[PDB]
Design a protein around this ligand. Structure first.
Ligand SMILES: *[C@@H](C(=O)N[C@H](C(=O)N1CCC[C@H]1C(=O)O)[C@@H](C)CC)[C@H](O)C(=O)NCCC
Length: 320
């Protein structure tokens, strides 16, 4: 009923019983504040739970707030449901007890599915603007002070100066002088036509260079833009590692890793490459936008020091 005229929102349907442990009842209109519900795209129930946890209670899942194993979130055949699996979530009321000393109204918030306003400590009706960052999370890098609405960046010049012969562009069409270009998009004039929300098709071949030319809209905060881009890093940028020639390069649009999922996904990708850096060329106008650059894919065993990329991201976003 709240899911009327939606083909791909099973993640939201599977979340209903998890959210109900914290008294939450999402209306269609409230669901519509999640971008991928509004545009009806496939998603991670887990990332959306973390997004909703922050908006409602001002805390992300590393708070332990939904760490009670009450309701399963299970993915069978690209379909999220509540079928038994050892991946279970639900309001953890011992954590609510621990948190209540610092946050007195929080127990009532999670009992009645109301927003705990981390500024006032008072209860509000659902509004995605009230809690913009998780207060429990120590951000690995600085976020931009101000954001502006700029035209889309043109990365044609940056990709043309990368080393390699065969490019796969994923998302928005990109011209690359001097290289062989295949194009992955849901546009019908694409070399490979597919839904990008289901990820890189397994049957896509291997390349020297993969460029993820996929953007995510800014709405409320750098933190929001980042967590909304997290599923694209997972479905496109991470899967690109299966589509690379040995020593190949993956470059991806991104917004840092303000959220836990982005930080984990970026760290998992980085271990597959000899070199990992964050670049912001002159072409990149939108202030939150960076390029993640992964060079020398070799599927070796290697340790990743996140402080390297975090340092670079802090410099870029603070203008240091
Ligand atoms: C999963 C998805 O949306 N699956 C659909 C589904 O079961 N729906 C549509 C919306 C409510 C629910 C229902 O009516 O029971 C199914 C009909 C599509 C074949 C979605 O594709 C997803 O997020 N996959 C996981 C992404 C990795």
């Amino acid at each position: 009923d709240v899911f009327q005229n939606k083909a791909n929102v099973c993640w939201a349907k599977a979340l209903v019983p998890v959210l109900k442990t914290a008294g939450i009842d999402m209306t269609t209109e409230q669901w519509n504040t999640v971008d991928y519900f509004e545009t009806d795209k496939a998603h991670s129930a887990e990332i959306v739970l973390n997004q909703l946890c922050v908006r409602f209670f001002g805390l992300d899942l590393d708070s332990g707030l939904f760490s009670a194993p009450t309701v399963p979130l299970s993915i069978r055949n690209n379909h999220w449901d509540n079928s038994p699996s050892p991946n279970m979530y639900g309001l953890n009321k011992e954590v609510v007890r621990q948190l209540s000393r610092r946050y007195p109204q929080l127990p009532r918030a999670v009992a009645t599915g109301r927003v705990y306003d981390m500024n006032t400590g008072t209860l509000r009706n659902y509004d995605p603007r009230i809690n913009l960052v998780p207060v429990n999370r120590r951000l690995p890098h600085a976020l931009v002070l101000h954001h502006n609405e700029h035209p889309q960046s043109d990365f044609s010049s940056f990709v043309s100066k990368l080393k390699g012969r065969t490019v796969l562009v994923v998302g928005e069409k990109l011209s690359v002088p001097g290289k062989m270009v295949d194009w992955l998009s849901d546009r019908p004039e694409a070399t490979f036509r597919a839904r990008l929300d289901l990820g890189i098709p397994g049957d896509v071949p291997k390349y020297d260079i993969i460029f993820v030319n996929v953007r995510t809209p800014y709405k409320y905060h750098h933190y929001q833009q980042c967590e909304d881009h997290a599923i694209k890093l997972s479905m496109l940028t991470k899967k690109a590692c299966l589509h690379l020639n040995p020593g190949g390069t993956c470059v991806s649009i991104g917004y840092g890793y303000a959220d836990r999922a982005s930080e984990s996904i970026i760290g998992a990708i980085a271990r597959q490459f000899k070199f990992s850096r964050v670049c912001k060329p002159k072409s990149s106008l939108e202030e939150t936008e960076v390029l993640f650059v992964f060079i020398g894919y070799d599927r070796k065993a290697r340790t990743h020091n996140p402080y390297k990329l975090s340092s670079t991201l802090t410099n870029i976003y603070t203008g240091s």
